[PDB]
Amino acid sequence: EIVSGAPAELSRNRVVRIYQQAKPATQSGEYGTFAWRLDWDIVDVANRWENDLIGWQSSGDYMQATQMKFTSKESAIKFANKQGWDFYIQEPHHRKFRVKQYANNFVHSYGKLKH
Amino acid sequence: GLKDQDRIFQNLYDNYGWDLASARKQGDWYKTKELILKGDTWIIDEIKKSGLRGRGGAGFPSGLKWSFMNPPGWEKNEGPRYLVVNADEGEPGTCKDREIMRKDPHKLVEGCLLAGRAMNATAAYIYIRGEFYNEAAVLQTAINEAYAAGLIGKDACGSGYDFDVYIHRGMGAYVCGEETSLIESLEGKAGKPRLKPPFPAGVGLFGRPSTVTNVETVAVAPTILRRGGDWFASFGRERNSGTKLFCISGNVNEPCTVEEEMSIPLRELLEKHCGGIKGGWDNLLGVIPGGCSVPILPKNICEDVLMDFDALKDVQSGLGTAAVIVINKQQDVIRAIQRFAAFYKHESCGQCTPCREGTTWLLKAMDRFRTGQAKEREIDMLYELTKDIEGHTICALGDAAAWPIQGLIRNFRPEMETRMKKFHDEVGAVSVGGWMKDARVEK
Amino acid sequence: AEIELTIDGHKVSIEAGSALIQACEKAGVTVPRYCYHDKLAIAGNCRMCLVDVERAPKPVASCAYPVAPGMVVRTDTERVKQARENVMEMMLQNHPLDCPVCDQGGECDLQDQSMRYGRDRGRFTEITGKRSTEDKNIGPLVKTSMNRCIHCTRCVRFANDIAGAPELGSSGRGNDMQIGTYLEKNLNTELSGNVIDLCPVGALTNKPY
Amino acid sequence: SVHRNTENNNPSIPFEFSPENMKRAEEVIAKYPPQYKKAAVMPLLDIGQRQLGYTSISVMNYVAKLLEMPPMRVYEVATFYTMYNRTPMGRYHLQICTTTPCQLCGSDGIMEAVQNTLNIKPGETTKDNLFTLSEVECLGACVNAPMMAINDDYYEDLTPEGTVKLLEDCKAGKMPTPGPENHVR
Amino acid sequence: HQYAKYIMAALPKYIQGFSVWKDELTLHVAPSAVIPVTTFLRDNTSTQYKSIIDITAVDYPSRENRFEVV
Ligand SMILES: Cc1cc2nc3c(=O)[nH]c(=O)nc-3n(C[C@H](O)[C@H](O)[C@H](O)COP(=O)(O)O)c2cc1C
Ligand code: SF4
Ligand code: SF4
Ligand code: SF4
Ligand code: FES
Ligand code: FES
C-alpha cells in the first residue's frame, strides 16, 4: 500500500478514531446514533495554542476539524485501511431493556414511600 | 307511558327519618341478614337487572363497574380490598349531600355495607368534603351509632364480614372529586390523579385494589336490594332507569331540590315543582342541565327534549350530575361561563400540561369576551383551542373545562358579536410603558 | 415473554407488560417526549407522546399505556399530528422568551423538537400577560430560572427516586405550580448536578458554566 | 393566585401541638394500616389548624417529623388545600361564594355589601383582625345561592340587610343559623 | 415513468435501475459500459438529446466503490 492522493505523512504518524457518536444526555433525541465518525486526534504539540494579538485559537493541525459521516463500521474500517492509516475503533453502548409498568405505585409492608 | 311526579311511595324521605329508630321505621336495616348471607353474585345480578346508571358523571352502568371489581384472581392473597365513597360533591349546582348526607345517612351506612358485601371489601372509606365540618360531625356520630350498636363492624347484622367505615375529609379540591385524585388524596399525597390504563379495579387503591362510588349511587343500594330490580327498571327509558335527584337553582322562581323521575319534560320539571322561571317560560336565556360541565341548551330545544341521559346525550348534553341551573333572559351567559373559566382555574390540578395553560388561556379569552375586546375570528380561534383540550388530559377535568365553551359557540353568537360591537379597534393601539396601557382585563 | 405489536407496518416483539414508548424506540420510530425518561419512573405529565391505538377513543399516552398483545398503532394519523401541534402550542403559550439567553440554546429539547411538530401563531395580544414565576435558590452550584419550567417533573422524580434527597418537591395548582421548595432552602446532596442535564428545558442549569 | 411564598415573617420552626391533640391524632392514625401509613396527614393538619390557626411551617414540620415523613411531601400536601390558611387570619374567616348560581341570585351585591361594611379588598383581612375576606367557589350548597360561609358553617339566603346584620352580630353575638326560615323547597 | 420503462426495455444489458424524482430522471449505468449507452440516448431518434450540460462527480465514501459520477 502506497497512498495515491494523500500528500501528507498522515498515514504513518497519527492515530485516528472510528466511533459511534454518543447519545447526548441533555436532549432526548437520537440522531447522532445513526452515523459513524472518523476523527483525527489532537495528540500534538500543535494542538490548538492561544494567539497573543487578538486571542483567537490559531491551531497548527492542518486537519483539526474534520469529520466523515459513514454508514457502517465495517465500511468505515474498510475505508480506513484502504486509504491506510492507523485507527482505533470504539464500540458504542446501548440502553438496556427494563420493563416499565407505569403501575409501580403499590406496596406491601415496607418503610420507604415515594411520590 | 309518559313520565310523572314520581309517586310519593319513593326511595328517600328527609323529613321524619333522621334517627337510628325512625330510619328503621322507614324501612332500613330491615332484611340485612338475608342480604349479606345471600351471595354477592345475587347482588350483581339484582343490580344488573336494576339498570342503575352511575350518578357520578360518567353515567355508567353500576353493575358493570361492580362486577369489574371482581376478577377470578381475587381469591388469591392479593391483600385487603376495600372501597371508597366519593362523598365530595364539588361541581357548581349539586346540592346532593345536604339532602343525603346531612339528612339521610343511615341509608348510606348500610349502602356501603351492602356494596362492600358485593365487593368482598374489607372496609370502606367515605370521603366527605372537609368543607362540610357541620355535616362531618353529624355523619361521624351517625356512623358511630351503628358502629357501637353492633350494626356495623365485625358482626354487621350477623355478618361473616368484618367491615369498617372510616370517614375522611376532602380539603377544598374539586379535582379530588375525580376518582383517581381521590385515591392519591387517600394515599396522603397531593390531590393529583394517575393516568387511566392501570384501571383502579386492580391497580392498588391505597395499595390494594378498590373502587370508587358516588354517594347517591350507593345510597339507593340497600333500598334497591330490598325492593326488586324491576322497581327501578319501571321508570325512565329502556336503558336509563329509575328516579334521580334534581337540584334546581339559578335564576328561577323557587330554588329547590327534589328526587324525581328520569326522562321528564324539563318544562314540567320547572313549572310543577320549583315555581317556574323567574319571569316565566318566555324569560329564560339558557339552561345549564346536569353538570356544571355540560353545554347550554337554547330556549327552543330546552322545551321538549327529556331529562334523561341518552336522548340528551343525543342533544350533546351529558347530564352526569342532574343539577339544573336556569338563567333569566336579563342576565349575562358570558359572566356565567367566565365564572366557570375561573372555576376551572381554581380547580385544575397541575399534572396535565394542557389543562393548566388551557384554562389560563380560556380565562384570558373570556375576559376579552366579557369586555368586548375580541375580534370575530377569535370566537372560532377560541373554539379551536377548546378542541385542543377536548381529549388530551389525564382525567376528565380538562374535558369538563372544555364543555362549556363548546356549548357557548353552539346555539349562540348573536351576543358575542353584540358585545364585540360595543367598541371599535380590537387589540387596541397601546404602548406598555412599565405596565400595559389603554385597556386591561381582570387583575 | 415476547409480544408482536404493529406500529405502522413495523411489527416488533418486545417483552410483556412493557412500555409502548419502548416498543416505538425498539421499532426505530421517533416519538416526541418530554416527561418520559429512561431511568426514571413514568409520569403522564408531559402529554406529548400521544399515539393512536385501535380500540381506544382517544390517542393515549405511549409513556404509560401498557403493551397489549397485537395492537395496531399509528403515529401518523392526522389526528395524531394535528393534535401534537395542538399540545405543543398549549405547552408554549406560557413559556418565557429566554431563547437567546436561556443556556440550552442548541439543546432546549423543547426548542429542538418544536419546529418539526409546531405551530407559528402563539395567539396573543398586548392586553394579555402570560404569568411570572419567582426565581429560587437551590444552591450556589446550580443556577436556577424557574420561569422556564414546563413542569416535566423529571427533576422531582430524580431527586426522590434516584437521589434520595426529596427536598425538591412540587407545589401549587393551576398556573402556580412551582418546583423546588418554598422554604427557600438549598439542596446540598450528592449527584445533585445530574439534574441540570436532566431538566430538558434550561430552567435548571450550571452555575460556573 | 394561590401562592407558594417564603417562610421569613416570624414563622421559623418554633411551635408544637397540645395534650388532647396527640391522643386524638393516635385515634385518627388508627383508622389506617400500620405499614404504609401516611393517610392521616390531611386530618392531622386539620387538627393542627384548629389548634393553631394559620397553619405555619412549624406545625407542618412537626407533623412531618411525627408521621416519619420527609417534609417536602407534607408541603406538597398543604400546598393544595385552600383550607390550610397560611397568613394570619382573623376570628371569623368570611367565605363568599361567587360561583355561577350564587352570581345569578345576587352574591355580587352581597360582596358589595360586605366591602361597604368592611372596607377590605377581598383577599385581605380587617385591620381589627376580626374578619378576613375570601371569595370562594361553590361549596355545593346552591340551595339559597346568596349564601356564604363563615369559618365553620353556611348561612343560607342572605339579603345585604341580613348580611350586614350578621357582620354586626358576629362581632360579638353568635348566629347559629342555617337561614332566616327553616326548610329547603 | 413510462419513458424510463421504455429505456429499460430497450437497452436491458447496459442499464441498471432507473430512478425518477420530481420531474427529472436518472439512469443508473454499470461503469465498464458507458460509451455504448451514450452512443444511444444522446443520439437516438426518440431520444435526441445531443447536448450535455454537466459531467462531474460526487463522493459518498460509505461504500467500497467510492465516487459516483453524474
Ligand atoms: C373531574 C371530575 C370531577 C368529579 N367530581 C365528582 C364530585 O364532586 N362528586 C361525585 O359524586 N362524583 C364526581 N365525579 C365522578 C366520579 O368519577 C364518580 O365517583 C364516578 O362517576 C363514580 O361512578 P358512580 O356514579 O357509579 O359512583 C367527578 C369526575 C370527574 C372526571
Ligand atoms: S385535567 Fe389534568 S391538569 Fe386538570 S386537574 Fe386533571 S390531571 Fe390535573
Ligand atoms: S428552554 Fe430556554 S432556550 Fe429553550 S426554548 Fe425555552 S427559553 Fe429558549
Ligand atoms: S425542575 Fe426542570 S426538569 Fe424539573 S420539572 Fe422543572 S423544568 Fe422540568
Ligand atoms: S411522558 Fe409520555 S406523555 Fe408525558
Ligand atoms: S352555588 Fe355557589 S355554593 Fe352552590
Highlighted features:
5 chains; A: alpha+beta; 2 helices; 12% helix; E: 70 residues; alpha+beta; two-stranded antiparallel sheet; two-stranded antiparallel ribbon; 27% strand; binds flavin mononucleotide; binds iron/sulfur cluster; binds FE2/S2 (inorganic) cluster; oxidoreductase
Question: Could you explain the architecture of this structure?
Answer:
Chain E: It is found in: Mitochondrion. Chain E: Belongs to the complex I 30 kDa subunit family. This is part of a larger assembly, with chains A (115 residues), B (443 residues), C (209 residues), D (185 residues) and E (70 residues). Chain B is an alpha/beta fold and 443 residues long. Helices cover 37% and strands 11% of the residues of chain B. Chain B contains 17 helices and eight strands. In chain B, strand 5 (243-250) and strand 6 form a beta hairpin. In chain B, helix 3 (40-50) runs antiparallel to helix 4 (62-68) and helix 13 packs antiparallel against helix 16. Chain B starts with 20 loop residues before the first helix and ends in a 23-residue tail after the last helix. The longest helix of chain D is centred in the C-terminal third of the chain and has 13 residues, at 160-172. Chain D is globular. Chain D starts with 18 loop residues before the first helix and ends in a 13-residue tail after the last helix. Chain E is α+β, with helices and mostly antiparallel strands and 70 residues long. Chain E has helices spanning 2-10, 35-39; strands spanning 15-21, 24-29, 57-59, 67-69. Chains B and D meet through strand 3, strand 5, strand 8 and helix 13 of B and helix 2, helix 4 and helix 5 of D. Bound molecules: flavin mononucleotide, iron/sulfur cluster (SF4) (3 copies) and FE2/S2 (inorganic) cluster (FES) (2 copies). One iron/sulfur cluster (SF4) binds at residues 175, 193, 348-352, 355-356, 393-395, 397-398 of chain B.
